Write a protein that binds this ligand. Structure first.
Ligand SMILES: FC(F)(F)c1ccc(C2(Nc3nc(Cl)nc4[nH]ncc34)CC2)cc1
Ligand SMILES: [Mg+2]
Ligand SMILES: [Zn+2]
Length: 343
């Protein structure tokens, strides 16, 4: 359960902005797997995505500042099995895919799409590999600061994003007017807070009403609801890839969850079944998660955007795969080598 922080640019300045096709001919496709990109090339890819969506020119972002901001964001992640920089990078890449494939400019303002992308990069900053309940039970400093207000980790991720912006030479919004700077801060707050599953459960009925009634580009509340759904779709986007990706990501999620469970047992507390390596049955847990969480999210995206139908079908397909592998996976927890390669 010990996950380190790396700390407390010239290569990026020389040629950090590359045309996206030079990274991969399939870079703008829903079939691209951003986790296949070497970690050392992710900062360059973030700049390339911002350049390709024309945010650098349109918002007059200073490249050296953007380069330092990206490197600070990357250094802001610890190394738990799942909630690390590679997860934030892939979430950010999915946000770029939504922009490239769904024509978001017809549903949201350019500033909202910009905030969505930046929020994707920052959304799990300084994650400790533990959930909100753990912060409360361990009586952590983060729970002392935010438990009374809800979404302990999410409030911390936002606070860490703000601290990066307040670091000298990293303020990418420095030249914005007081009104636009505040709007960026407000959007990032709401978008990051939408990554709390408890928040998604609370607004579901309203998201399912919006899809039923149809999207209204002049309803400010519809813009807020869409941003929440888009953020959760980016957060769970590993579920829209091939079966090898979903299987590997399930292995990382449970390595992280089981370490939290071992830590709660060492504290003399009984963990949730899904966090207990002696009780958890991963195929059944993934089928419930796919059915209750990911599948309804992508079905809502399909209802609002017809081009997103392939995403839902890919998620439904990965859920069907868990049913088929459950015959070959006959143990609780993970095998001794923490790998699901045997499947
Ligand atoms: F809000 C939301 F965006 F929908 C969201 C919902 C769940 C989660 C996490 N929990 C999961 N639990 C299980 Cl069993 N499998 C998983 N696969 N990918 C994620 C995830 C990672 C914390 C994050 C965001
Ligand atoms: Mg999170
Ligand atoms: Zn996340």
């Amino acid at each position: 359960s010990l996950y380190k922080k790396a700390g407390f640019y010239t290569k990026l300045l020389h040629d950090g902005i590359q045309p996206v096709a030079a990274i991969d001919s399939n870079f703008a496709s829903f079939t691209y797997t951003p986790r296949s990109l070497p970690e050392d090339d992710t900062s360059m890819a973030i700049l390339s995505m911002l350049q390709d969506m024309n945010f650098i020119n349109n918002y007059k972002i200073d490249c050296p500042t953007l380069a330092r901001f990206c490197l600070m964001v990357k250094k802001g992640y610890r190394d738990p099995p799942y909630h690390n920089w590679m997860h934030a990078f892939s979430v950010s890449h999915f946000c770029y895919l939504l922009y490239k494939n769904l024509e978001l400019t017809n549903y949201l303002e350019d500033i909202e799409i910009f905030a969505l992308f930046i929020s994707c990069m920052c959304h799990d900053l300084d994650h400790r590999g533990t959930n909100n309940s753990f912060q409360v039970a361990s009586k952590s400093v983060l729970a002392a600061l935010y438990s009374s207000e809800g979404s302990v980790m999410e409030r911390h991720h936002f606070a860490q994003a703000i601290a990066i912006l307040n670091t000298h030479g990293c303020n990418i919004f420095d030249h914005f007017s007081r009104k636009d700077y505040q709007r960026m801060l407000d959007l990032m707050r709401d978008i990051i807070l939408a990554t709390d599953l408890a928040h998604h459960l609370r607004i579901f009925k309203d998201l399912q009403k919006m899809a039923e009634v149809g999207y209204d580009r002049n309803n400010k509340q519809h813009h807020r609801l869409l941003l929440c759904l888009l953020m959760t779709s980016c957060d769970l986007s590993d579920q829209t890839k091939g079966w090898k990706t979903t299987r590997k990501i399930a292995e990382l999620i449970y390595k992280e969850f089981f370490s939290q469970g071992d830590l709660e047992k060492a504290m003399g507390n009984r963990p949730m079944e899904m966090m207990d390596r002696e009780k958890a049955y991963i195929p059944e847990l993934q089928i419930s998660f796919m059915e209750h969480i990911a599948m309804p999210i992508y079905k809502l995206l399909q209802d609002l955007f017809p081009k997103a139908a392939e995403l839902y079908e890919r998620v439904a397909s990965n859920r069907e795969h868990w049913t088929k592998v459950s015959h070959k996976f006959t143990i609780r927890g993970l095998p001794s080598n923490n790998s699901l390669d045997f499947l």
